Amino acid sequence: IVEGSDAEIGMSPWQVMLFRKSPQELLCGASLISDRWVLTAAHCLLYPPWDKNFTENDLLVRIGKHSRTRYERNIEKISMLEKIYIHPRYNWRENLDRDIALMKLKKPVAFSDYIHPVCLPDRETAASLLQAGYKGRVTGWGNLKETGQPSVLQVVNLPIVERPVCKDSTRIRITDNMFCAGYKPDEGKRGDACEGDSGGPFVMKSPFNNRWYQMGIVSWGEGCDRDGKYGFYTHVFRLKKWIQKVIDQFGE
């Protein structure tokens, strides 16, 4: 996060760290959706142009964290992965369309003050909140600067931007499976996701039931905080049946 703030304690209880076993390292963000399922971006696991391709073994999931770097002695929980599922039509060859993946943990995790799942939107929720101008929230332990590392979990609040405007800022082909978010240069107010933030949640708080909903997955952007540029996210409601389906077939 660029131009964000340190999170309060128990502010984003679904926040998950995707951690490399060796070299022990911060891969990306992710989000907890039940006691045995985690949601992240497909590009955190598979990116052939960069020879990136992680399996279950290469990874560790860390839940309940606040500090980036410290072992959080009786707070955090470490989980091992049972299976990885990537969307079958994830397009890595051209615009990262359908950038989504599920993670099935070996054993159910126990909730606590610092560990709790976020909700998945229903058609009606998507319908009233996913509007240009409405603000959502992004969290992560990523870069603070385009070109260091924060000590604690960062937070930033950003507005959804109109499709045309999104379309008009890049030479990449945007899909219905994407949405862009950020402040305009006019609006002079700023912030963005940055390297290492990838795959965490874009959440909204519903005014009807006062519940937190995950609408986006931090997907891609050009630079971090660049004027006239925006952050792109995987449109979670549009991939809901695929999600629904893998949980139906392989789990819960």
Binding site: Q24, L26, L60, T69, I78
Partner: peptide
């Protein structure tokens, strides 16, 4: 990054 206790994994 502090190491993770063999007793956490």
């Amino acid at each position: 990054y502090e190491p993770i206790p063999e007793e956490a994994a």
